[PDB]
Every structure is written in structure tokens, then in C-alpha cells.
Design a protein around this ligand. Structure first.
Ligand SMILES: CC(=O)N1CCCC2(CCCCCC2)C1
Length: 185
């Protein structure tokens, strides 16, 4: 792909983070802490899952960013509506305002309802995310495999401002402690 020129500088929004997340000083890395991280509750925080939003809101244009997923067993990545549900249980689906892919139990899947199997020959260490607001497109690229396409959501009905979306995943296994990192431009 040739989307690199729409690169945007994404930072994480502390106030939206699940209370067990640790966001780095530069707001470019997030990982799941071994306990509650000593913050007050608020109506923005994701309660049930180790999720956080980017600070940036997008309502027009073309945007591209890259995330490092090295040595993680589980994670979700993509975009979501600014008004997505924060509290309780929910599915990652376009009907609920999410355009996402994930890794879970050695398989990659797109967050359609029901979910779609992805065909990845080279497990990615870095994922590229491309949003075209006007076209209604969210695409995912395998940076480890020379930028090969992973998945395109088309005919997206965003129905609001979009925010970058992250889930570091659970660490029940002790093998998923590694952070998500926003990669340099
Ligand atoms: C180890 C692990 O991953 N756990 C156990 C502790 C609670 C959970 C943390 C993630 C935030 C939401 C609540 C679930 C899951």
C-alpha cells in the first residue's frame, strides 16, 4: 500500500483506560498492570475489558497509524465511535460502533457479526490501520509481511466521530504481559 503519507501521531487517553492499564509518560505505550492502578472511576473508563481509546477524534479525511503487537497472545485493534458503550459486557461489531481485528487462541479474526476468519501466513509484529472517513473504509495491513492486506471493512456507517481503539487483552496465561506500542512515523 501507499497510505504511509496519511500518517497521524496517535496518543492514548488515560481517562478512557480500564483502571488496571498503565500508560507510558509519552502516552504511546499501554500494558495491563498486575493490580488496580490507583485512579478514580469515571463514566469514560472501559469496566469489563483492558481497553483504552486514542485522544484523537476523526470526522473527515484519511488517517494511518501503526501498532507494535510483538510477543502478545491476545489483543484487539481498530477504530470505534466516540459514543461506544463503556460499562458491562458487549461484542466488538459494527452494529455496536467498532471496526476491529483481533488475535485470540492462535487465530486472527475480523470483528464482524459473526466474526470472520483472517488468513495470515506471517504472524504480524506490527499492524497498520488505515481509515478513509468519506469512503467508509477501515483497512488493516501486515507491516511484518511488506504491508500485505489483512482485512478491509467497506460500506462502513461510522455515524459519529471515530477514535483509535485498543485492547491489550487479559493475562490469565502469564504470556500476554507485553505492551501495545504506537510505532514512530
Ligand atoms: C489477569 C487478567 O487478565 N484478568 C484478571 C483480573 C481481571 C481482568 C483484568 C482486565 C480488565 C478487566 C477485568 C478483568 C482479567
Amino acid at each position: 500500500h501507499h497510505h504511509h503519507h496519511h500518517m497521524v501521531h496517535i496518543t492514548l487517553d488515560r481517562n478512557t483506560a480500564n483502571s488496571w492499564l498503565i500508560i507510558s509518560k509519552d502516552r504511546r505505550q499501554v500494558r495491563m498492570g498486575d493490580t488496580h492502578q490507583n485512579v478514580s472511576d469515571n463514566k469514560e473508563r472501559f469496566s469489563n475489558y483492558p481497553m483504552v481509546l486514542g485522544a484523537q477524534r476523526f470526522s473527515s479525511g484519511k488517517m494511518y497509524w501503526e501498532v507494535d503487537v510483538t510477543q502478545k497472545e491476545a489483543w484487539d485493534l481498530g477504530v470505534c465511535r466516540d459514543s461506544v458503550q463503556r460499562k458491562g459486557q458487549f461484542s466488538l461489531s459494527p452494529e455496536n460502533g467498532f471496526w476491529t481485528i483481533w488475535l485470540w487462541q492462535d487465530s486472527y479474526e475480523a470483528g464482524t457479526s459473526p466474526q470472520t476468519t483472517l488468513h495470515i501466513q506471517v504472524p504480524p509484529c506490527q499492524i497498520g490501520i488505515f481509515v478513509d472517513y468519506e469512503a467508509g473504509v477501515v483497512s488493516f495491513y501486515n507491516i511484518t509481511d511488506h504491508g500485505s492486506l489483512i482485512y478491509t471493512f467497506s460500506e462502513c456507517v461510522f455515524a459519529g466521530p471515530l477514535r483509535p481503539f485498543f485492547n491489550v487483552g487479559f493475562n490469565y496465561s502469564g504470556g500476554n504481559a507485553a505492551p501495545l506500542k504506537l510505532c514512530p512515523l
